Amino acid sequence: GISRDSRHKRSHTGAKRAFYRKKRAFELGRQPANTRIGPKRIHIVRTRGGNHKYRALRLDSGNFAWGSEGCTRKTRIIGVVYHPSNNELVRTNTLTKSAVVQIDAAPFRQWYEAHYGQPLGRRRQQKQGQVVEEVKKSKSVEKKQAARFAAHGKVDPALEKQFEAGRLYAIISSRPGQSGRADGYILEGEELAFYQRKLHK
Amino acid sequence: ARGPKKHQKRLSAPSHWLLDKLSGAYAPRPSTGPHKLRDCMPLIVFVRNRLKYALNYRETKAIMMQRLVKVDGKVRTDITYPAGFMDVITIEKTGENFRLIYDTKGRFTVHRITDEEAKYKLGKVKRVQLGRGGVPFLVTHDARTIRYPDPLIKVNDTVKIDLETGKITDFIKFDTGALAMITGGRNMGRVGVITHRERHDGGFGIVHLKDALDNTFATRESNVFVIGSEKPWISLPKGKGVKLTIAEERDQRRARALAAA
Amino acid sequence: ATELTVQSERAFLKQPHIFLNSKVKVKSTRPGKGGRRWYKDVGLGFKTPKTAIEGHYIDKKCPFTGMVSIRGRILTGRVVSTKMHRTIIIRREYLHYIPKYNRYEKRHKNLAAHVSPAFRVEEGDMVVVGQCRPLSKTVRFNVLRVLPRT
RNA sequence: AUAAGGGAAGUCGGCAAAAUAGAUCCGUAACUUCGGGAAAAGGAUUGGCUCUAAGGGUUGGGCACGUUGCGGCGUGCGGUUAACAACCAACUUAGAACUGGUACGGACAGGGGGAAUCUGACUGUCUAAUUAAAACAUAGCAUU
RNA sequence: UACCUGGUUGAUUCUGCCAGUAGUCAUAUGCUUGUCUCAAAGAUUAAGCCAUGCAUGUCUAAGUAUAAGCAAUUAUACAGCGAAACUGCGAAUGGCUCAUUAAAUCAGUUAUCGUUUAUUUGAUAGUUACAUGGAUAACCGUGGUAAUUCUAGAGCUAAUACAUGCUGAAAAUCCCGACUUCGGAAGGGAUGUAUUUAUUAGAUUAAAAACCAAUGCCCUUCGGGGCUUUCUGGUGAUUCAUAAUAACUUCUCGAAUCGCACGGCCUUGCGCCGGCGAUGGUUCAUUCAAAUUUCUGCCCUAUCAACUUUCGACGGCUGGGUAUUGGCCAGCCGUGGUGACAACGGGUAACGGAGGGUUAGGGCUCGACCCCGGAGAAGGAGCCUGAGAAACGGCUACUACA
RNA sequence: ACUGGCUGGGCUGGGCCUUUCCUUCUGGAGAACCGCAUGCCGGUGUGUCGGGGAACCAGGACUUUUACUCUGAACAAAUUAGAUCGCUUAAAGAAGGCCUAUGCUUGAAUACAUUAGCAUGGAAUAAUAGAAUAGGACG
Lengths: 201, 261, 150
Ligand SMILES: [Mg+2]
Ligand SMILES: [Mg+2]
Ligand SMILES: [Mg+2]
Ligand SMILES: [Mg+2]
Ligand SMILES: [Mg+2]
Ligand SMILES: [Mg+2]
Ligand SMILES: [Mg+2]
Ligand SMILES: [Mg+2]
Ligand SMILES: [Mg+2]
Ligand SMILES: [Mg+2]
Ligand SMILES: [Mg+2]
Ligand SMILES: [Mg+2]
Ligand SMILES: [Mg+2]
Ligand SMILES: [Mg+2]
Ligand SMILES: [Mg+2]
Ligand SMILES: [Mg+2]
Ligand SMILES: [Mg+2]
Ligand SMILES: [Mg+2]
Ligand SMILES: [Mg+2]
Ligand SMILES: [Mg+2]
Ligand SMILES: [Mg+2]
Ligand SMILES: [Mg+2]
Ligand SMILES: [Mg+2]
Ligand SMILES: [Mg+2]
Ligand SMILES: [Mg+2]
Ligand SMILES: [Mg+2]
Ligand SMILES: [Mg+2]
Ligand SMILES: [Mg+2]
Ligand SMILES: [Mg+2]
Ligand SMILES: [Mg+2]
Ligand SMILES: [Mg+2]
Ligand SMILES: [Mg+2]
Ligand SMILES: [Mg+2]
Ligand SMILES: [Mg+2]
Ligand SMILES: [Mg+2]
Ligand SMILES: [Mg+2]
Ligand SMILES: [Mg+2]
Ligand SMILES: [Mg+2]
Ligand SMILES: [Mg+2]
Ligand SMILES: [Mg+2]
Ligand SMILES: [Mg+2]
Ligand SMILES: [Mg+2]
Ligand SMILES: [Mg+2]
Ligand SMILES: [Mg+2]
Ligand SMILES: [Mg+2]
Ligand SMILES: [Mg+2]
Ligand SMILES: [Mg+2]
Prior knowledge:
This is part of a larger assembly, with chains A, B and C.
Chain A: E1 36-37, E2 41-46, E3 52-59, E4 61-65, E5 72-82, H1 87-91, E6 100-104, H2 106-115, H3 140-152, H4 157-165, E7 167-172, H5 176-179, E8 184-186, H6 190-199
Parallel strand pairs in A: 1-3, 4-8
Antiparallel strand pairs in A: 2-3, 4-5, 5-6, 6-7, 7-8
Chain B: E1 41-42, H1 43-50, H2 57-65, E2 69-71, E3 74-75, E4 82-83, E5 88-91, E6 96-99, E7 101-102, E8 108-109, E9 112-113, E10 121-130, E11 136-140, E12 145-147, E13 158-161, E14 168-172, E15 179-182, E16 191-198, E17 206-210, E18 216-220, E19 224-228, H3 246-260
Antiparallel strand pairs in B: 1-4, 2-3, 2-5, 5-6, 6-9, 7-8, 10-11, 10-13, 11-12, 13-14, 15-16, 15-19, 16-17, 17-18
Chain C: H1 50-54, E1 74-81, E2 88-98, E3 103-113, E4 126-131, E5 141-146
Antiparallel strand pairs in C: 1-2, 1-4, 2-3, 4-5
The complex binds magnesium ion (47 copies).
The structure holds 3 RNA strands.
């Protein structure tokens, strides 16, 4: 089948090499698996030495970790928006490592409300459709929460705007074809400015 | 070549086994175990070729099936079991104990030891580090791993092994003034005192030794095996590894022969 | 070396596992711990150049601030080509001995090595290189020191 | 204008008809006056639709005084935006996916080719109304 | 044993080749042939074609026994020896051959901080239970086809085959907090290991202060004198070893297995406890290794002087794939790499080396062949099982034979 | 063959002074030369005595760079050279030997390769580098 040896190549002087031996059991290759966004579907493959790998054909959710805060929550992926290597990867909504995606921001906002007693990204006050208040069953919690809010600090405006829409930018940092999982982190800071300028221009 | 080998050709076996080039085409092919294949002492070679207790291959395994012979206090039942340096071989029915140690010519020799000395060993340490759960451990030259060692013990040292409970009881640092025995190279079997050591960054440091007769020699660090500071802990064989020249051997040979007869 | 910009590519260039967006600010002397530039020492009496520690370039093949370890032979030669990007060609000369005629003859070989942006290399200079893992089809050595010009 | 199977067996003779044909990318011999032969010979691709990338123009640039109905000049200087920002404008080229009764220079337009012999070097000219040729002319060469 | 003689001329001294002389683990052939010790042998021309037979199987006290099996007669669950069949392991080692191959194989010397590893050896894993559920072979019985180590449908029964499954402990660490006197707290959840991602620690190795913010405290005459301080391994070199936190997974492992001995406690219940082996099992170490990899070294030829990038040729970057590195492959961007110190191409009656033959010294020539490395099973390609094969005494297809 | 001697003459090597001699810091253990008192017949154990560190070991920094030669390390068995032992001799083989033993004892050495790579001593011969627009050395 597919081979990844260097015998068929051409030497650095330009000379053409001669036939040496038939293809070997090692040095083989395998058909690439193009992950897509959809209902979960994974195949098992028996690799060298009796181990196993996990082919991911369709995925829709995975772990994503918030850097500054330090929380990791499972959420779903909406779509692929940028890819530094090839544009056709973006159009197909096929996801690999170092692919910029958009994820649901619901689980991360909820944790912020419980940890800090302040609201994050709420411009629905004009509509006030879903305004609701729950009685706080203590008063030391404000002492605990106000200490956290005054100490750690506040979110920068760039990340706050995304929370209003409910969509967040992330980068896949796993290899779905190998491990069968799509994992990443929320990108922020100067790295956010690089992609936002490149994304719409 | 499509897998691992399982045959050993005679004329390709290690030289220090002293095997005749005739009478067969193959060699014992020592099985995998604690000692390297190049420098090991298969049990069949020891029992049949040196002690001459067993006449041939067929009767060599007859002895082993009766669990008569054991090494390091545990019975072994395969004829091609790789024994090596410092190993203790005990045969209770005949009533003697053996220790495998090099002579001055770089080969294994028979060496009687007393029963009181046949209940401990010593081996060079290979690595020290932290294992699973943070428990420190070390591994010796014969693939013995022991947890919770003395923090003062470092690599290249030697440790005395109980051989009944497998616990370290005292150790020797690796430094100048120690008494050492060589295990590899052309100076194999010599005994000397470490004079000084020179190290080269990038590997392959060398150490300079000195014999009892003021002779001098050098070897790589991987072939030096500390066996004591003074008055070596183990009992050395006859000749004590002094490496007489060819001139003295024939002088001593005739002097001993004519004196006796 | 001369590099116009550090971020001039499709992706974002950064050292792996060096976290850069922390709410609390802590000042530490350690290179990689606090969030500032990371670098190491190769050893074998090789000193880290000043340009490496205080520079802003990003390179994953440089022996300094990189993911390559140097082990094996150390060789010397003279550079003959500097017309690629972060790669040079050195020339090594020796003498082969012909036993029958009891005298020698000249021979030479050509070698390819990776040069880091820390150094500035021109044609006709002597360099010292060290072995590393395969970085390309024909690159297995890395530049370590540039000898002074006459 | 079209024809099953055969494909010049017709005839003084392939006379008449058929076949080839646009553009883009590959490939190309003997011979030679080294300019040619050459479009040699011989192969592949071509619609519709939804997208991606490249090739341009114009106007804006910091202080310190003086004139003047937020500024145009007088200047005194400094700096080279690790080239940014707004607005404006036609066409030409390359690449990818999906789609069909595998069709797409869809009509029109549009070279058959190869191996040799005889003869005039070539472009050019003539028997208006039966002969356009190997005939005439030509540069070059020689004589009076 | 550092050696020479015949032949051009009427005769002479030379250059010069032809011929003679000796060896060969170097093959053939002619004539002849009594004994002892040793024993090469279808390599050369055809890696041309092959009738018949053989060359790979395997059971211990210890995985499964209702043989209309044998043998005894202590075993009313089984119990001695034990065909058949299921299950486990091996069949990838040996043995044969030299077609291809000219920096390729190979030799000596390095590297793996760039990977996989059955087996052997040494350590090591507290989260209905007095025992869970359906199938199948041998066997009985009924058949098909000229034909093969072809197989059908019907009826019984096993597992170390296949598939499920049980906090027996506390402490500590980290979140939520029922409830106030505002200074800590009822009780509630998670917390082994493997898998995947993000974050934190992993110290230095000469010393004396003086300030801002404010708290475990000791002594104490209440004016306070004040404040000594606990760990941290390794390499020439790392983001190493190892540990902690937030989460994740068609998701693992942590024993429903087997044989010998016949023992000890008292609340005497067909109760509790207890020894040595076999076979398995997660991670680290070791062993037999395997795959890649650094430096230098090969015969003749210029009537072979420029070569490499159509459709990767040299390098940069982001990924894909692989046990892992890598232009090994996919996209985007630069214009390089080798050569008179002989590249590139053609010849080889060419597998490489240890080494054989012949000798003053220096050399010339041969090496298919018992040892080591590589490749192949008529010619090409593809793949299953497995720790390990691109296997041919394994399978699928085309070509050529039969 | 043993032993001593020659103001024995030679050969190989190590120390000092001649303008030259030999880098440097930290630590280890500790001598020689010194005096202190305590004891025998002008020398000596004296002791957690001190002025004191010859040499040695471990660690850090500095030193123009190659070729060449010396000594080491690492590297295969068989083969070549070669030591030992009367297979009845020999080509071979790795065996055997001793009184008599219900036992004892030994051998299976050593050299060579040789190009490349890794260390060490030497500093002749052949190349190479340094202060001249001082961009030089030292405190
Ligand atoms: Mg090393
Ligand atoms: Mg017709
Ligand atoms: Mg027709
Ligand atoms: Mg036709
Ligand atoms: Mg006709
Ligand atoms: Mg006609
Ligand atoms: Mg016509
Ligand atoms: Mg027509
Ligand atoms: Mg032309
Ligand atoms: Mg043309
Ligand atoms: Mg054409
Ligand atoms: Mg033509
Ligand atoms: Mg098209
Ligand atoms: Mg056409
Ligand atoms: Mg047409
Ligand atoms: Mg004409
Ligand atoms: Mg007319
Ligand atoms: Mg006409
Ligand atoms: Mg001669
Ligand atoms: Mg003549
Ligand atoms: Mg004559
Ligand atoms: Mg002759
Ligand atoms: Mg006779
Ligand atoms: Mg043949
Ligand atoms: Mg039985
Ligand atoms: Mg087995
Ligand atoms: Mg098998
Ligand atoms: Mg084989
Ligand atoms: Mg044969
Ligand atoms: Mg085990
Ligand atoms: Mg099972
Ligand atoms: Mg780590
Ligand atoms: Mg890469
Ligand atoms: Mg050039
Ligand atoms: Mg040859
Ligand atoms: Mg051949
Ligand atoms: Mg050969
Ligand atoms: Mg042949
Ligand atoms: Mg032969
Ligand atoms: Mg054949
Ligand atoms: Mg297996
Ligand atoms: Mg094969
Ligand atoms: Mg095959
Ligand atoms: Mg066969
Ligand atoms: Mg076979
Ligand atoms: Mg002999
Ligand atoms: Mg030297």
